[PDB]
């Protein structure tokens, strides 16, 4: 059930920068001149790995950032990627955020806080047999929050990061 996850350049708002290794992910101070692929957030400030999960069961590691401005989980497959998107369920968004120094579980139309620790690194744990999303902190893997979801389509890790002194990780 543990994968190996890569972020996928193709999807990548042009603002990003992804480390060599395609597993960071930050804010650059401009936006790169990439060509509109498709898969490309044009407006929000979002990555997607570039593999995605149909079935099953799949978890991975996120290192996160001290700092403001990431968010991350899973999208399904069909999150508009051009245009201006709001960050929410409803528009095909699964995530724990991190900013005005309190983590949230991005639900709408109030995001709900969470009263967890400091977080470091945490386990997405995406099972569509379930019908859930879930993130763990890792060190005692305890349990940060569930989205419960009735995903038809294929579901990818998905990153965001809009403040230039945070970041995300793909861990290790
Ligand atoms: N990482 C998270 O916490 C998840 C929110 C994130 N937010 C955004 O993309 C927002 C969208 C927006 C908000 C307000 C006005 C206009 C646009 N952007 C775009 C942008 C470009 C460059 C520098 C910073 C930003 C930024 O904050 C997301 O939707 O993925």
Known sequence: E???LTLD??????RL???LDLK?????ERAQDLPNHPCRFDTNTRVLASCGFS?????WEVEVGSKDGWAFGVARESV???GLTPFTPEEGVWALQLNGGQYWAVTSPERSPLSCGHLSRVRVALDLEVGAVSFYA???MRHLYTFRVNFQERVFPLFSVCSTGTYLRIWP
Do not use: F, W
């Open 138 to 140: 890792v060190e005692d």
């Open 80 to 82: 508009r990627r051009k």
């Open 24 to 28: 960071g992910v930050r804010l650059g």
């Open 55 to 59: 079935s099953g069961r799949h978890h």
């Open 17 to 19: 920068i992804l480390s």
């Open 9 to 14: 350049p193709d999807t990548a708002n042009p």
């Open 2 to 4: 543990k994968v190996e």
